[PDB]
A paper describes a structure:
Carboxysomes are proteinaceous bacterial microcompartments that sequester the key enzymes for carbon fixation in cyanobacteria and some proteobacteria. Carboxysomes contain the enzymes ribulose-1,5-bisphosphate carboxylase/oxygenase (RuBisCO) and carbonic anhydrase (CA). CA catalyzes the conversion of cytosolic bicarbonate (HCO3−) into CO2, which is subsequently utilized by RuBisCO and fixed onto the 5-carbon sugar ribulose-1,5-bisphosphate (RuBP) as the first step in the Calvin-Benson-Bessham (CBB) cycle. RuBisCO is a hexadecameric complex, comprised of eight large subunits and eight small subunits.
To resolve which subunit(s) contained the substrate, we performed a refinement of the RuBisCO map without imposing any symmetry, leading to a second map at 3.8 Å resolution. As shown on Figure S3, we observed varied levels of density in all eight active sites: for one chain, the full RuBP density can be readily identified (chain G), whereas in two chains (A and E), no density is present at all. Finally, we observe partial substrate density in five chains (C, I, K, M, and O), which could correspond to one or two molecules of the reaction product, 3-phosphoglycerate, and/or a mix of states that are averaged out through alignment. This confirms the activity of the RuBisCO enzymes present in carboxysome, with various stages of the reaction cycle present within one different subunit of the same complex. While we do not think that there is specific cooperativity between the eight subunits of the complex, this might indicate some correlation in the catalytic reaction between subunits, perhaps regulated by interacting proteins such as CA and/or CSoS2. We also note that in the map obtained in the absence of symmetry, some unattributed, diffuse density at a lower contour level is present at the surface of the complex for one of the subunits. This suggests that, for some of the particles, other proteins are bound in this location. Nonetheless, this finding provides evidence that there are other proteins bound to RuBisCO, which likely originates from the broken carboxysomes. We note, nonetheless, that this density is not in the region of the complex where CsoS2 had previously been shown to bind, suggesting that either CsoS2 has multiple modes of interaction with RuBisCO or that this density corresponds to a different protein.
Numbering used by the authors:
A (entry chain I), B (entry chain G): 11 to 328, 330 to 456
C (entry chain E): 11 to 188
D (entry chain K): 95 to 282
E (entry chain M): 189 to 282
F (entry chain J): 6 to 113
Amino acid sequence: EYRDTYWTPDYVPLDTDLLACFKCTGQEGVPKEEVAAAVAAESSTGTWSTVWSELLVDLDFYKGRCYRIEDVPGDKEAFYAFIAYPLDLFEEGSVTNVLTSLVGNVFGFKALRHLRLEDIRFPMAFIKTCPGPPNGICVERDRMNKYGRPLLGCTIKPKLGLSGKNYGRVVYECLRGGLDFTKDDENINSQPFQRWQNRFEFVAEAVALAQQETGEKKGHYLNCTAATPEEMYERAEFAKELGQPIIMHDYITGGFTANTGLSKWCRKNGMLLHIHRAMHAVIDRHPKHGIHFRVLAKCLRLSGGDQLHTGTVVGKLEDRQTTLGFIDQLRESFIPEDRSRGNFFDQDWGSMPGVFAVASGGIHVWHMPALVAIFGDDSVLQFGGGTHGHPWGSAAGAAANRVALEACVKARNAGREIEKESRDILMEAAKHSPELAIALETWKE
Amino acid sequence: EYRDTYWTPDYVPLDTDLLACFKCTGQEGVPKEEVAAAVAAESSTGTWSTVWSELLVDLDFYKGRCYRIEDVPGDKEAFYAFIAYPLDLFEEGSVTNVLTSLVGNVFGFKALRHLRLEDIRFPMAFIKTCPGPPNGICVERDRMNKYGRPLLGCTIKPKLGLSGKNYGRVVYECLRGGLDFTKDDENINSQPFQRWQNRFEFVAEAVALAQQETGEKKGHYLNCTAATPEEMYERAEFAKELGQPIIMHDYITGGFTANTGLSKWCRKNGMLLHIHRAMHAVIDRHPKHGIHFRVLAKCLRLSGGDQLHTGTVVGKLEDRQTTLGFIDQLRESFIPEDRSRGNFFDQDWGSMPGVFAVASGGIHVWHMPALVAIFGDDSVLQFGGGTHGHPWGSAAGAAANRVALEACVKARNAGREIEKESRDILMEAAKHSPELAIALETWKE
Amino acid sequence: EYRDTYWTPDYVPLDTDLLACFKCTGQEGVPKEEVAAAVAAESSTGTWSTVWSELLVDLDFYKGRCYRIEDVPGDKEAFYAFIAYPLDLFEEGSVTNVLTSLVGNVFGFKALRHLRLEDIRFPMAFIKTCPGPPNGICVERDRMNKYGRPLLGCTIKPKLGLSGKNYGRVVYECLRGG
Amino acid sequence: YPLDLFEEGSVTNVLTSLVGNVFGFKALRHLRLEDIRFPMAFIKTCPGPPNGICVERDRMNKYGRPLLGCTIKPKLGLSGKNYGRVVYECLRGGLDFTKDDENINSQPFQRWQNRFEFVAEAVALAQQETGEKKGHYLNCTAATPEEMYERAEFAKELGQPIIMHDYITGGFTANTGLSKWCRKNGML
Amino acid sequence: LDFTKDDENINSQPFQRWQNRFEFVAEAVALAQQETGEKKGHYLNCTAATPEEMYERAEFAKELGQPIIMHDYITGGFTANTGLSKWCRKNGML
Amino acid sequence: TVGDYQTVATLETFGFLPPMTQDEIYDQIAYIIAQGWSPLIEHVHPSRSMATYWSYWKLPFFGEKDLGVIVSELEACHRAYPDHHVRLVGYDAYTQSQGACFVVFEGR
Ligand SMILES: O=C(O)[C@@](O)(COP(=O)(O)O)[C@H](O)[C@H](O)COP(=O)(O)O
Ligand SMILES: [Mg+2]
Ligand SMILES: [Mg+2]
């Protein structure tokens, strides 16, 4: 057991294989080839021992081998490990099994100091078994009848404390000002001061009462995360009986099993699904530990959910090259390879619909000229206090955001540089909007 | 917006509040008072911003305050952040809600360079609303009629390749050899080369036949993990109608929602649960980032399960003081405050039965006497290649471990020191069993 | 509407395309690629007419194209028309859909006199979505514990006429005999 | 042939009994089944048409003229909203029926849950404009009988009057199961 | 008139199914109720050969909203009559 | 008065701005044709504004490269229906979406 049968420099991966990239840092002085083979062994099979039973199976077919060795540019002790795995190791249409198989054990092995999974080449045979998005981007736009602009969203503040009536009072004001989404926060599942059976029914009246007064279709994410799938599906059915168009779920804190369970429920019931990436900074934040959010983005797009947070936009998560690296994977059908944006594999989705890219985290009125030039129109903007922070109330603030973005896009199609003439497009729009005239004065500049 | 309102050194924590302990290191130059208050704010409210809706709520009730600041011994830039959270911001009986409220947002906060969660004081009021373990330790011991000795186990190898009949044949060898548990690998959910409906029915034949031959009751943790919650229950009931006593489920990747849903399913159906902690090294391995495994152990004991992986025993995780810390939280009824073992708070579980502490990671015969003294009798040992590495097959290996265990136990009750007298206890048991004689020779020393 | 748009002698089959083999002969005098294009057009899109609704769609992606023409051995008017189909045209995990899309309409055409479907190349993506055999040879042998020899069967005779108990009487004799 | 060799109400039984084996026999070079005289006692047990001509005319309030229909084109490519857009224009021009092509059962580019939903308004919007009842056959051909019943029931909940089915390839068993389902739910 | 009767001979004939008669009679009952300004009903004959087929016709009649039904007790059996009799009390028909 | 915001009914997009000038229409349609989309015209009475499908006028202008033609058919629908909206839509043929949907005339 000294490996190097997991290190095959001649193999060419099959088109049905699932490749991976591990930015691995090894022990001092050890040959770089040995550690990649060890990584391949502990993540696929964890063998050879000295066992009679290990001869009943021709293990040469099932063993995942490392086929290419590369070094991370600008650093010496680390390297890039490319490994090939057969398709037979994973259950069809299951995302929980692949995460457990790949990153489930190789992290715990003591011969590695820092390990990081970067990208996966999902084969079409595995993609076609996964459910994918329930609606997609184009079907969401067609159902909601909104074309040619990024959508609007807000987060209700305060998160904790408002009862059923006050919550409906607050959401009703934001909806009637120009917005079309309000987000039930992750903190709100079922509190003693405000039960879900009371929040669900009274947010239904506020959405329907302001919908007819504006003439547009509006929605409100209802937090349906629960401690048990039996209770969670109950909230889903109660939301259906009220006729709400869109719901919300926490996939990292709820498990991919429950996330897929909700994904297969919405498609049979024709609803739009929103996803919040809670706890994501535990695994993603540091550059040598954990799993890149891009891997989680691919796994989420395969699992389901029509809208996923990208964040964090204060002023931006950064780098822009990296964020667009996995934004294209959330929206396109085929994403070419690019090291500048970190696309290690030629990722093809075929005919799988895309997922909206949601930007949030405290956007104010002067961020609009830079927010649209990067995310495009297939995006959703969700403010924390941008709507509520208007001195005239939370209803007039919504018109200040709606007017600002519409001038922004209408300047974008005209061939102007929105990111460059921010003041020239914001001020001239304020000449036809008194609410924007004060909103631009408040959060200066 | 200047904070310092959350940092109240005069507040007295209540017996019903949820406490916490954070190891933090802020930006260069900032006072410890400000950064601790910011940590408390981003985990409780994320307020006060400029919002007009924030005056409709009595905010002082739902605010999380820091009442104590301690300095980390051996470090200068670090300190301990003790915070008390009111009981009214958490749903009764949900484990996914408390962690979402805790680690959902504060980890993305920019003003903190290092963050680690170490201790939580769960009040008895929230403990009483949680489902808890299905059977526990004493109920499992009563049901399976195993007293006075730790239980044994084995991991079936090879991980990939065995068919339905060969899997049961390998299982039948180990069960008839002396062991009383076998573990399905975490990769096995439902493979193309081995469907789960064939593995369930074939392993149901090996268990029953070896059950009567030896005269003992045996169990086999069946991997009931699935892509959807509906498929999980179907496998659970299919295993139930086959008469298997114990099942296996993966909590991190299956999600707390699904784990609790299966946890409340087992109590009515009389099934015992085995828990596998996959990819855990992402979070608990690094001492500056992530969550301590102690928090996960408490959350599991609150959520359910009767046995849990602790690992890793190669030759030990090290140091032993920390391992005995959360193990005391996994088994005991009352836990005092001890800084040496990391017991930062007085945690009382009331009358909830404990959970078995299962060691793993390639234990062999010579490690066995030292694994008995530290873990006690409420422990389970699992060998992946240790059992199957015996030259005389797969049943002779189990006989060697079973003989060695019982001699070690009987020498412990005789007042001898098992860990210091491993030799004088081990070679004397080899004169009554030739299988142990070759097992001791092949694995030296 | 003169075809040869479906006749792509340069197309390269993909790893997701579902290929087919057709042995065909058409009306006398037609060029060989013309009848191949005709076979290709109807089983995929049966187009182009003069319709405003036919421009709402990028119809160059969904078109099924015949890429290879080979001569049938022993015949002069017969040929092999190999045709490629994008995977987007069939429902995942359905065996009825492929037959309905393939031969549900093409056989009813007038310019083809003799058409024979010979082989189908199923792509792995479509294969992985189908249910397939429930147990298979290996699982059946494992459950029946019959190894190394072919299995023996028989048909009960007479087929029509036997009553309820006489049927069991006849079946028991065959089973107990070997 | 005697009547005792055939099952009551099972059209599949007469096929496998009559045509199942005779064609494979070696002593025949050319064979062709032309006509079969079905006895009345065997006819009576069969469900027959769920509505028939007279009931269809009575329910649709269309008399004295052969009905008109159209097939949606192109067969492949139209999204969910485009299908409804092209269905609505044909119905508002005078026709009373629009057809779903056999290729459209459930395609990746146009799911059946969206085809059913976006057809529901085109029929319902062009019906009120002309004052005439209009229909649109929704293809319920499925790989499993559980799915075909689901599609038929979903069509019923939408209030659609008529559906479509492929019996030659979809199986006489499935067609008969759907045929009896249509009678109890008042579907065409 | 306020009631019209379905005579006992009419249960389910090939020239007139029980599903077709129920739906077209339902339109006439409602269409005449609004014109006259008085509540009008029409007895529907729910006699069948099997007890569950009686219940299917009864529930189909309820879904169409007819208030009154008919049953033949001597030729239908006191068992079936009592089965429908207690069914009407929990459904509130005549 | 300040600060009291009255609920205003806009149709879908570009509602919150005053009506576009003639030159704004010019570069908007220039962009929509430069993207390779297909211009499409719709019109309804203000009562049936919420309806899923509007009325074509007359057909989607597939493959039109001249800017002097569409700017002549926008007013024909308005003069023919002086009490109707004039919606201008961009048909995305490749992805079956609509990248631009803004109403030109509010309706006299
Ligand atoms: O490395 C070893 O020493 C073994 O392979 C045994 O070798 P032998 O067969 O030579 O004894 C260990 O069992 C595995 O590493 C982990 O054990 P498990 O998979 O059981 O958890
Ligand atoms: Mg938030
Ligand atoms: Mg393992």
